Design a binder for this molecule. Structure first.
Ligand SMILES: CC(C)=CCC/C(C)=C/CC/C(C)=C/[C@@H]1[C@@H](COP(=O)(O)OP(=O)(O)O)[C@]1(C)CC/C=C(\C)CCC=C(C)C
Ligand SMILES: [Mg+2]
Ligand SMILES: [Mg+2]
Length: 284
C-alpha cells in the first residue's frame, strides 16, 4: 500500500468528486490505464481551477513549471511547487507513456486567456476554444487509450474531446451566463435572433431552441463520426470510451426533457449510466 498508490488514490478522489460521468466510465478500465487517466484528470482539474485559488495566475504558473520540470527531467526528483500528490503521479505516468506536453501547455494558455474573456465572433473561434480546453485532453489521453498512436488516432481523440466540450457548453448555458460567460458565437446568436440575457429572464422560445439544437446536431454528428472510428483505440478502452461518450450524449436528452432550462444543471442518473453500459456490452 505504497506512497505512489496513495498519490493515485488522491487523483482518483478528485475525479470521482468532480466528474460523475467520466469517473463512472473510466474507472472500468484496466488498473494501469485507469490510474493513468486519474492522474491526467487531476492535473487538468487543477489547471482549470487554479485561478480562483488566490485570484491570480500564481498557482497556474506553478502547475506549468511543475509540468515543464517533468517534461525536461522525467527521471529526477522534483520538489513540486503546486500539488505534490498529482505531480508525482503524472511523473510516474510520463516515465511509461509518450505524453504530449504541448497539449497541456495549450490547455493552460486557454485558461490564461479566459481571464480576459471575450465572446466568440464566429463558430470558428468557438471551435478553437473547444480544441484548447478539450481537444487537448483527447490528445494527452491518446497514448493511454490506444496501442499504436497515429495521426488518425489523435484526430479521433481530439474530435471526441471537442464534442464532449460542446455538450458541456450546451448543458451549462444558464450557469455560464451567471458567470458572465456566453459561448454561443455572436454570428450564430445574431442569426437566430437570441439574447441569452433575455432568455435567462423570460424562459425559452423557438429561437433559442433552434439555436441550441443547431449546436446539438453538430455535437451528435461529431459523436457518430467518432463511434465509426472507435477502433483506433485499444480493445479494452473501446467499450469504456463508447460509454463515456454515450453518457455525455444522453445529457442532451436530459436538457430537452427539462425544457432547455437555464436555471439548473441537468444530469444522467447513475442508474441510467449502468443501463447504457449494459446496452454497450451486448454489442461487444
Ligand atoms: C482527463 C479527462 C477524463 C478529462 C479532462 C478533465 C478536465 C477537468 C479538463 C479541464 C477542462 C475541462 C473542464 C474540460 C471538460 C471535461 C468535463 O468536465 P468535468 O468538470 O470533469 O465533468 P462534468 O462538467 O460533467 O462535471 C470536458 C468536457 C473535456 C472532456 C474530454 C475528454 C474526456 C477527452 C475525450 C477523448 C478521449 C477519451 C480519447
Ligand atoms: Mg465538474
Ligand atoms: Mg461547463
Amino acid at each position: 500500500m505504497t506512497m505512489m498508490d496513495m498519490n493515485f488514490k488522491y487523483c482518483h478522489k478528485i475525479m470521482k468528486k468532480h466528474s460523475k460521468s467520466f469517473s463512472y466510465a473510466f474507472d472500468l478500465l484496466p488498473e494501469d490505464q485507469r490510474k493513468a487517466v486519474w492522474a491526467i484528470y487531476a492535473v487538468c482539474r487543477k489547471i482549470d481551477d487554479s485561478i480562483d485559488v488566490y485570484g491570480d495566475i500564481q498557482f497556474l504558473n506553478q502547475i506549468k513549471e511543475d509540468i515543464q520540470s517533468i517534461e525536461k527531467y522525467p527521471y529526477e526528483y522534483h520538489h513540486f511547487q503546486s500539488d505534490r500528490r498529482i505531480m508525482m503521479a503524472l511523473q510516474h505516468v510520463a516515465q511509461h507513456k509518450n505524453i504530449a506536453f504541448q497539449s497541456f501547455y495549450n490547455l493552460i494558455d486557454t485558461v490564461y486567456k479566459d481571464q480576459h474573456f471575450t465572446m466568440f465572433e464566429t463558430d470558428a473561434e468557438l471551435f478553437g476554444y473547444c480544441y484548447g480546453v478539450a481537444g487537448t485532453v483527447g490528445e494527452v489521453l491518446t497514448p493511454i487509450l490506444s496501442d499504436h498512436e497515429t495521426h488518425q488516432t489523435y484526430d479521433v481523440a481530439r474530435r471526441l474531446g471537442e464534442s464532449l466540450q460542446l455538450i458541456n457548453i450546451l448543458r451549462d448555458v444558464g450557469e455560464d451566463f451567471e458567470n458572465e460567460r456566453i459561448y454561443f458565437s455572436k454570428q450564430r446568436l445574431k442569426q437566430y435572433e437570441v439574447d441569452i440575457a433575455e432568455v435567462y429572464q423570460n424562459g425559452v422560445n423557438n429561437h433559442y431552441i433552434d439555436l441550441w439544437e443547431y449546436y446539438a446536431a453538430i455535437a451528435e454528428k461529431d459523436f457518430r463520426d467518432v463511434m465509426d472510428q472507435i477502433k483506433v483505440f485499444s480493445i479494452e478502452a473501446q467499450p469504456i470510451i463508447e460509454l463515456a461518450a454515450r453518457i455525455y450524449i444522453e445529457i442532451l436528452d436530459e436538457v430537452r426533457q427539462a425544457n432547455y432550462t437555464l436555471h439548473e444543471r441537468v444530469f444522467v442518473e447513475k442508474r441510467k449510466k449502468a443501463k447504457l453500459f449494459h446496452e454497450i456490452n451486448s454489442k461487444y
